[PDB]
Design a protein around this ligand. Structure first.
Ligand SMILES: Cc1cc2nc3c(=O)[nH]c(=O)nc-3n(C[C@H](O)[C@H](O)[C@H](O)COP(=O)(O)OP(=O)(O)OC[C@H]3O[C@@H](n4cnc5c(N)ncnc54)[C@H](O)[C@@H]3O)c2cc1C
Ligand SMILES: Cc1cc2nc3c(=O)[nH]c(=O)nc-3n(C[C@H](O)[C@H](O)[C@H](O)COP(=O)(O)OP(=O)(O)OC[C@H]3O[C@@H](n4cnc5c(N)ncnc54)[C@H](O)[C@@H]3O)c2cc1C
Lengths: 472, 474
């Protein structure tokens, strides 16, 4: 019964399932171990894919129900929401994509073992299926793609009915009247905006005095806040959550206190969303037996080749340090199995972009103005408002700006910050530019098609290199 | 009449080429004068071209989705969806109005002098315009920049009255949705304007001399697939067919006499509105070229060298008035690098890096060379294809139409061509433009991390399918 393999990847997330396909195409005998019953990990089942679907569907409702569609001569009498069908589109997408990973596994001759795998040896990993039937796999190299889980709030138990986590908010059966979201990060802002667009009164509470989560420019974050609040988003900043108490009616009273602690308030909501953070998932893997010591935050330490202290054991994804993003895990999985094949392993996390898929979109790659302030790097600022982009005025989507940060002397593009429409796809152009080591002059002299939103990317680069943009 | 103005650069034209070149040169330390005959700055693209058409293309697609099964299928239930064409056109007009004022504000912000009139080159170092009133304005300038632009290429024997027989202009300000419409010319402008009204309930039949759609330099695979998707959207395409003539009738409808390009297969089809857009051509009327002896080319474009200079050194010409793709970003770049050469610099622009976008839904955008262009040149290539049905962000949005085709050289793996048919192709092609400018290979693009989930992931995954041979998610 025990199968032998070359590379055994524990995990079907973005990291694992991509690494599984890649390694198999590289000539390796690969085995993917999945504890859940649907391949895809967090991003496909409970993470990126479902949230983006609801964000799109809600935004389309917001435009119809709002002044937008009427403003373009699309006059409608009755706009109504069938939440069952909106969620049906979410379900249809996730189902097809999960099955795709399965088809891809067979297309690329990857072995799927459904079970809870545990490393039972330097060259041995044992999975436990729910039934109890053993499946031990001995392999030369082991890849840990176990992923992450939701960080629990002290004293607040998520029941996924009235007090939900990221998971529960994605399969809610009714729109809350008032909703309190703990955590003003990417996951929080997105899910809050979804229900706010669907008629909920959404108040978000944050210990920190900024929005948008990790590594967001303050100018970008502040302007993001201003636009969201006008859309109807309520933000309680610099505030610690004292506690949560469920009531007889079924509502949740949320005890709130200032970050200093001076002013306490108790607000009510129909649904409480908890998403203060996510944490690496290293439960029951055997790491303690093998003596791979975790880090204080719980992430598996690895070298630049993504090997653990034990050489033939590798670890990639949310389980290791770095941005807890899906394309990060994807790249880390590819380059890891490519180093096993004999290649070199280099990844600059400065090139890794971060996208908030709201409307307006927020996407950034590189370093914020603040990060450069601390490091001592003097920079020039280039800003082009979307109110001057032709395609944005054409589409009546004049919100936000593109901020390009270039070194005062070398003109190297140090950071790219895009607040506004289509920022999620625009940041991939900045990623390509940063990898090449481009300057602000390089980007400006490349012809960008007219009229496109990407023209703001070029014009902001010009305003940083030359000092003056053409159309502003 | 007024005192002769002396300047460094005098730009004849307020189009994308002229108005950008005017701003750039003024910021470069030159004394600049922009001469525009019309009363709204912006040229074709702002007044009659890109901006108005893209506005209606966007508004029509939103209508098509609401009126269609799409919005309901995602849980957006609407009882009565109706079209107030008056307001749809009001949004188009409001945008163009504001953008026209923007060019004016930009000119005043950058100390550019605007002279409204029909300019005439009255000297190697002098240009005098004739304003509508007749009061003349003499401008002495070291160098003169010709950005006069283009005009509608007329079909022989069909006179555009801008009521029943319209050009691009009239199709953009129609006052009622035609029941049946015939478009002469299945190019970019034709497909877009046809799709707009087809989505608004017109039965749109477009006729083309050639056996393909999408105009110049489109891959045949891309063009054929483009046709299929539009045809299911309700687009009628009579290809390989020449228009013998058009007759306006007593009722006011237009009978369009049709014959095959091969000959025979004759039919007379009827329509309520006839749109003529078989091409555009450079506008060089009353420019002063005859006095100075600058001879035009057979197709009517002003010949220029690599520095965009005419036969006369201090006279330069950029935009649709010269050869090359008749695109708005083309004129913009040529204007910048021309005035950058005037201040002191080298002038190089690769037309292979210039992208071409069809702003329909699905969008078509390509940069570089098609499979056909490479077959004639003798460049052997590898094909990399990633369908949008496998891109995560496309499946999430229920927008799985189309694919991305990457063409790479057999040996060097240099990205020779990038072809994107599908959602968001207009913004994705700028990434391919950036790659081609740097001279990147398919390996280079694939190893750059693309954010998940984004449509651009198809760009990366197709590059991988051309470099390595196997895509990850396909
Ligand atoms: C609501 C939400 C929205 C998000 N939106 C975005 C976004 O827009 N963009 C973005 O880039 N990221 C986003 N993320 C983050 C993204 O989901 C993660 O970064 C990504 O899932 C990381 O994948 P991974 O490779 O680390 O593996 P994960 O998918 O994190 O790992 C989970 C998988 O490992 C398996 N597994 C774990 N332990 C075992 C074991 N012992 N045996 C067998 N199988 C095991 C599980 O069964 C599961 O399949 C979002 C996350 C959430 C929660
Ligand atoms: C319907 C339509 C849609 C289009 N869509 C797109 C698209 O999506 N993308 C794209 O890239 N391109 C598009 N184009 C093409 C685009 O409009 C042109 O390529 C662009 O306008 C070229 O600008 P230009 O600098 O050559 O000057 P133009 O804009 O062509 O015109 C220059 C100006 O100079 C003026 N002028 C001429 N002679 C004189 C004179 N003697 N004295 C004073 N003033 C004078 C003219 O009146 C005009 O205003 C479209 C065109 C049309 C018609």
């Amino acid at each position: 019964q025990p199968i032998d393999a070359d590379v055994t990847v524990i995990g079907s997330g973005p990291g694992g399932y991509v690494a599984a396909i890649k390694a198999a195409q590289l000539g390796f005998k690969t085995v993917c171990i999945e504890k859940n019953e649907t391949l895809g990990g967090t991003c496909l089942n409970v993470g990126c894919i479902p949230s983006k679907a609801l964000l799109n569907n809600s935004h389309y409702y917001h435009m119809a129900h709002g002044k937008d569609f009427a403003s373009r001569g699309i006059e409608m009498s009755e706009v109504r929401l069938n939440l069952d069908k909106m969620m049906e589109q979410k379900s249809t997408a996730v189902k097809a994509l999960t099955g795709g990973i399965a088809h891809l596994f067979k297309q690329n001759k990857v072995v799927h073992v459904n079970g809870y795998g545990k490393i039972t040896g330097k060259n041995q990993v044992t999975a436990t299926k729910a039934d109890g039937g053993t499946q031990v796999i001995d392999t030369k190299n082991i890849l840990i793609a176990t992923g992450s889980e939701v960080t629990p709030f002290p004293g607040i138990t998520i029941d996924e009915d009235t007090i939900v986590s990221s998971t529960g908010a994605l399969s809610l059966k009714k729109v809350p009247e008032k909703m309190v979201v703990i955590g003003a990060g990417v996951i929080g802002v997105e899910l809050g905006s979804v229900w706010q667009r669907l008629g909920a009164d959404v108040t978000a509470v944050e210990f920190l005095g900024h929005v948008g989560g990790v590594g967001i420019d303050m100018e970008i974050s502040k302007n993001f806040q201003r636009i969201l609040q006008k859309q109807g988003f309520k933000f309680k900043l610099n505030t610690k959550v004292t506690g949560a108490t469920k009531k007889s009616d079924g509502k949740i009273d949320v005890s709130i206190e200032a970050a200093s602690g001076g002013k306490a308030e108790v607000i009510t909501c129909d649904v409480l969303l908890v998403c203060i953070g996510r944490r690496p998932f290293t439960k029951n893997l055997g790491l303690e037996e093998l003596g791979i010591e975790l880090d204080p935050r719980g992430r598996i330490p690895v070298n630049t080749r993504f090997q653990t202290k034990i050489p033939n054991i590798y670890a990639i994804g949310d389980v290791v340090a770095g941005p807890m993003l899906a394309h990060k895990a994807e790249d880390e999985g590819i380059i890891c199995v490519e180093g096993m094949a004999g290649g070199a392993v280099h990844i600059d996390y400065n090139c890794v972009p971060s996208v908030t898929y709201t409307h307006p979109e927020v996407a950034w790659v590189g370093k914020s103005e603040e990060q450069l302030k601390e490091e001592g790097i003097e920079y020039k600022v280039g800003k082009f408002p979307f109110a001057a982009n032709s395609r944005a005025k054409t589409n009546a989507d004049t919100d936000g700006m593109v901020k390009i940060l270039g070194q005062k002397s070398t003109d190297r593009v140090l950071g790219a910050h895009i607040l506004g429409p289509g920022a999620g796809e625009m940041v991939n152009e900045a990623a390509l530019a940063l990898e090449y080591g481009a300057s602000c002059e390089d980007i400006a002299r490349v012809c960008h098609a007219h009229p496109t939103l990407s023209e703001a990317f070029r014009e902001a680069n010009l305003a940083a290199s030359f000092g003056k943009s053409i159309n502003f």
